[PDB]
Amino acid sequence: RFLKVKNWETDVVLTDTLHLKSTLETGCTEHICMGSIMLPTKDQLFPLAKEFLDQYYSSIKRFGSKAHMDRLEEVNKEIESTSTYQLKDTELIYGAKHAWRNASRCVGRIQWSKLQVFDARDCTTAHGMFNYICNHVKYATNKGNLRSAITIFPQRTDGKHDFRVWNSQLIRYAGYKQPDGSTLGDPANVQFTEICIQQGWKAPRGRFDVLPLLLQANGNDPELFQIPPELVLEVPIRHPKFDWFKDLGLKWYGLPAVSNMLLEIGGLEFSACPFSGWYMGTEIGVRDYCDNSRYNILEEVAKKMDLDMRKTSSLWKDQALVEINIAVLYSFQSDKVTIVDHHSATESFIKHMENEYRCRGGCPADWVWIVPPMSGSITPVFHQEMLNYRLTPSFEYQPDPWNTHVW
Amino acid sequence: RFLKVKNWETDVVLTDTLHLKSTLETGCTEHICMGSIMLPVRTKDQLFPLAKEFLDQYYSSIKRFGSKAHMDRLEEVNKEIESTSTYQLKDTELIYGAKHAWRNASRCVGRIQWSKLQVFDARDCTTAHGMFNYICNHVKYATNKGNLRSAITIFPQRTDGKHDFRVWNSQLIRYAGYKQPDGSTLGDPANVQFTEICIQQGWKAPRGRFDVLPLLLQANGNDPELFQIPPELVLEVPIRHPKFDWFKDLGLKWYGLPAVSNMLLEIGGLEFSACPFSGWYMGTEIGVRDYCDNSRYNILEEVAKKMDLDMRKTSSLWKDQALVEINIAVLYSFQSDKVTIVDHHSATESFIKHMENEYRCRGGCPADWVWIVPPMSGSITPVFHQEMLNYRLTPSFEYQPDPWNTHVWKG
Numbered sequence A: 001r002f003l004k005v006k007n008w009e010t011d012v013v014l015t016d017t018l019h020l021k022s023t024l025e026t027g028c029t030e031h032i033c034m035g036s037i038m039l040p041t042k043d044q045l046f047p048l049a050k051e052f053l054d055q056y057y058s059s060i061k062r063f064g065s066k067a068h069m070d071r072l073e074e075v076n077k078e079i080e081s082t083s084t085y086q087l088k089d090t091e092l093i094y095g096a097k098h099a100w101r102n103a104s105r106c107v108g109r110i111q112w113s114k115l116q117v118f119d120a121r122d123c124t125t126a127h128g129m130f131n132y133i134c135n136h137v138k139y140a141t142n143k144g145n146l147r148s149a150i151t152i153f154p155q156r157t158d159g160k161h162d163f164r165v166w167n168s169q170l171i172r173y174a175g176y177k178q179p180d181g182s183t184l185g186d187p188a189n190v191q192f193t194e195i196c197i198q199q200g201w202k203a204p205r206g207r208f209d210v211l212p213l214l215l216q217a218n219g220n221d222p223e224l225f226q227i228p229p230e231l232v233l234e235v236p237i238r239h240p241k242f243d244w245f246k247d248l249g250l251k252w253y254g255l256p257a258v259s260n261m262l263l264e265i266g267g268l269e270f271s272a273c274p275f276s277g278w279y280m281g282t283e284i285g286v287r288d289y290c291d292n293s294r295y296n297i298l299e300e301v302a303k304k305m306d307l308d309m310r311k312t313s314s315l316w317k318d319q320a321l322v323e324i325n326i327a328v329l330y331s332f333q334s335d336k337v338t339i340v341d342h343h344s345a346t347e348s349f350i351k352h353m354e355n356e357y358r359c360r361g362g363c364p365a366d367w368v369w370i371v372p373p374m375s376g377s378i379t380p381v382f383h384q385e386m387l388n389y390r391l392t393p394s395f396e397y398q399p400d401p402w403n404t405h406v407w
Numbered sequence B: 001r002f003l004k005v006k007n008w009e010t011d012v013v014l015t016d017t018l019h020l021k022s023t024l025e026t027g028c029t030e031h032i033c034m035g036s037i038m039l040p041v042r043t044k045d046q047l048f049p050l051a052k053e054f055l056d057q058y059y060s061s062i063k064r065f066g067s068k069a070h071m072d073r074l075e076e077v078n079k080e081i082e083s084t085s086t087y088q089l090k091d092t093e094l095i096y097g098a099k100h101a102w103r104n105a106s107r108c109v110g111r112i113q114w115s116k117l118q119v120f121d122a123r124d125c126t127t128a129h130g131m132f133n134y135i136c137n138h139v140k141y142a143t144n145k146g147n148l149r150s151a152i153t154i155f156p157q158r159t160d161g162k163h164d165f166r167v168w169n170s171q172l173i174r175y176a177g178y179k180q181p182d183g184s185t186l187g188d189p190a191n192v193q194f195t196e197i198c199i200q201q202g203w204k205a206p207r208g209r210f211d212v213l214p215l216l217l218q219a220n221g222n223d224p225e226l227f228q229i230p231p232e233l234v235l236e237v238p239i240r241h242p243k244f245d246w247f248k249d250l251g252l253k254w255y256g257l258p259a260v261s262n263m264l265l266e267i268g269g270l271e272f273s274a275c276p277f278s279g280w281y282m283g284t285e286i287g288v289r290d291y292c293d294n295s296r297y298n299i300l301e302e303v304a305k306k307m308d309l310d311m312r313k314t315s316s317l318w319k320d321q322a323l324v325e326i327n328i329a330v331l332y333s334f335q336s337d338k339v340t341i342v343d344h345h346s347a348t349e350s351f352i353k354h355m356e357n358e359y360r361c362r363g364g365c366p367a368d369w370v371w372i373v374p375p376m377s378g379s380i381t382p383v384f385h386q387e388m389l390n391y392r393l394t395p396s397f398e399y400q401p402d403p404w405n406t407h408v409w410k411g
């Protein structure tokens, strides 16, 4: 019931008790581990509210207070009566910070308590959403000095009136198939790009075209908007040793902003809750750039380096991967845009694990996602045992809105 | 119940039915995943079901299920158990057993090779000197002058748990580690404790940075004894680099034969507590873990210095850069001396074809992603991108406690 986690590089052992608060299921059983699988009414609502409020009031040291009892009373009254309820701003902010705190796949959680939360629960239309989003983009971008933020749209009601951002991130590049058969731009987004076009977008059909926003308010058909270009901070990619690196013509955007998740607080569901922090270099340089089904540039780069691409055992892929990643970091640093390397990021997360074990009795973590996609065992998270489990408030996935939307 | 795994690079979805045969537990529950936790005297009672299930599998695999030969065997095992309390495996069953334990080892990336495994039957062995002789023969046969051959040597099974055969070394070949009075370590820090026991037991330690450890062997529950592997049987490779000439001057070498000697082999309910096995190395075992783990030889600093990388900021990726060089060096050195080795690209790609083949012929392949993905360059190998289901099948290789923690000394 009380579980140990050991670090095998340092011999440090932590006892997890937080997991005994876990609520939702993992996908594993005692016969089978699903650790590596990417995706494994009034009556329901009141227990959820209660459990949330109890943790809120305990966090502010008024557990069992009149105000605590008054609040459960009032919420209960409101559910009974209205069959949903409204969070106080303070509960909303607490909820958001804790969903991030509980996100076991996020390596950046040492920052969890410095989150700017923008309350967009008064929003009613897609123009309104667009406005909130641009303000979010500009506030978080902060001219290169990035600041974490989340903007929270109204919560689900009958599920006929959902707010959704159709983009998976606020900022991504488009994807186009050539008659050629190959893919121009980001192959991850070829479908979303199609939906934009079939909805009205005039694509410039380039390699790095910032996609339009596709915003749905109150369950209406979504609408298109171009983020003012001047709010989209982009970084040209050069290498500090290889002059020819810049001729590859690569750039990435500064703002990493996930927009397709569902935020659950005290049983309430916020289907549009775009959030943003800042990049760990490997996301772009290892995944965005070198995934086979992404920009997949390893071959072009190894070429330019004149490596022996004849046998896998020269480690030419490995060599090129490192250079690319050095360049990403160098470029963001030279242009003064916040970025973190995988060494620094994982070392900070180890320190956060320690704080969490000590002050909270644990920290849910997904080893498969936390260990960087390059140089695994030379980062300390590789050697750290982690327990993965689901605590609420949480961010969850939800189906792509195009599959659910009734047109 | 059918379970799907998906490869997110290729979109290949596979369907697992084999996990239905899984008996032992994982460590996980519906409420906690322990997929990254390293570690999450049998009675007649439990034993016949375990024998039965095994012999059913053996007879199926040979297209003789339900045959008279099948029934007579169950029959014979059943009477052997009730009367003697244990039973003896046929050679054919032992062979099938050892191969399937490898086939089922979900932390092994090398399993495309599972059906080519030389099994040495050492069940007639009685003494430590007997064990030493068996182990020398295995090393010579596996090494094969650089052209490595997978092998396993199986010592007598556990009886009452008071007469166990054990190899006290964790691997047949490993370098000594010595803690110095100033706190630094000479040689391999992973082997300081075991080195100390060898010394206590009478080993004259040369005290260098690459001293091959003696064998510490326990037969029949007796106190174990020391033997030095003939050095002519210990194939080693000096490490140099194809471009960098100062690399040789680091004075690195490694041995060629990777041989696990501390696992327990379970077959049909029998426990083989000494069952050393060996294949050949994937480059990263040595170049990433042995050389660059902080708690192992840890050469990253000295390497990067010599490369004169900017070392004052982690964001130079100086560490990542030295790491690739060292790994090229290891693969270069082995290929040049014609000692079998495989890079992590080649190995993982072969594993994916193995794993696919296993779903089509067998209905699954248990696999531990945390261990299968290589410890450098994870996502530029096809395994990173492969979903995997991990579960326990027997026959199997299991961990067991270190014998110095449990051994009852005779004097």
Ligand code: HEM
Pocket (backbone or CB within 6 Å): A100, A103, A105, A106, A107, A108, A109, A111, A115, A148, A149, A150, A258, A275, A276, A277, A278, A279, A280, A283, A340, A345, A369, A395
């Ligand atoms: C401050 C800098 C931050 C860093 C360096 C960071 C780092 C990361 C990384 C590397 C991932 C994995 C992404 C992937 O492989 O797809 C991730 C996922 C995630 N992060 Fe963060 N994060 C940061 C801020 C935030 C904030 C502000 C939130 C929420 C308020 C958040 C919540 C999450 C969630 C929910 C995931 C999982 C997304 C998914 O499953 O696709 N993070 N984080």
Ligand code: HEM
Pocket (backbone or CB within 6 Å): B098, B102, B105, B107, B108, B109, B110, B111, B113, B117, B150, B151, B152, B260, B277, B278, B279, B280, B281, B282, B285, B342, B347, B371, B397
């Ligand atoms: C033929 C070449 C082989 C290769 C390239 C290979 C590769 C590997 C690697 C890289 C590991 C992980 C080692 C670690 O990180 O600690 C491993 C583990 C393992 N391999 Fe192999 N292997 C091979 C042959 C064998 C053979 C012959 C057997 C048994 C007959 C075997 C059974 C296992 C087992 C049981 C493990 C798990 C060890 C542990 O938990 O400590 N492998 N293999």
Ligand SMILES: Fc1cccc(CCCNCCc2ccnc(-n3ccnc3)n2)c1
Pocket (backbone or CB within 6 Å): A038, A039, A106, A108, A169, A256, A257, A258, A275, A276, A277, A278
């Ligand atoms: F399980 C899955 C199957 C298919 C896709 C998927 C989502 C992968 C994308 N995760 C978010 C990537 C991303 C992008 C920008 N920013 C962040 N970000 C910002 C702060 N923390 C994360 N994260 C999961």
Ligand SMILES: Fc1cccc(CCCNCCc2ccnc(-n3ccnc3)n2)c1
Pocket (backbone or CB within 6 Å): B038, B039, B108, B110, B171, B258, B259, B260, B277, B278, B279, B280
């Ligand atoms: F769960 C654990 C906690 C602590 C240590 C541990 C074992 C680590 C060593 N793994 C074996 C390494 C090794 C060495 C030589 N050869 C092989 N080898 C040969 C064939 N397959 C693997 N493997 C597990």
Ligand SMILES: C[C@H](O)[C@H](O)[C@H]1CNc2nc(N)[nH]c(=O)c2N1
Pocket (backbone or CB within 6 Å): A035, A036, A037, A038, A368, A369, A370, B008, B384, B385, B386, B387, B388
């Ligand atoms: C199959 C496997 O779960 C999948 O490839 C995972 C592996 N680890 C990951 N880790 C992170 N951070 N992000 C990812 O998208 C993935 N993908």
Ligand SMILES: C[C@H](O)[C@H](O)[C@H]1CNc2nc(N)[nH]c(=O)c2N1
Pocket (backbone or CB within 6 Å): A008, A382, A383, A384, A385, A386, B035, B036, B037, B038, B370, B371, B372
């Ligand atoms: C804590 C964690 O599970 C531990 O470091 C594991 C990670 N993955 C590994 N993978 C391999 N192949 N070998 C190992 O020793 C480990 N160690």
Ligand SMILES: [Zn+2]
Pocket (backbone or CB within 6 Å): A028, A032, A033, A034, A035, B028, B032, B033, B034, B035
């Ligand atoms: Zn699990």
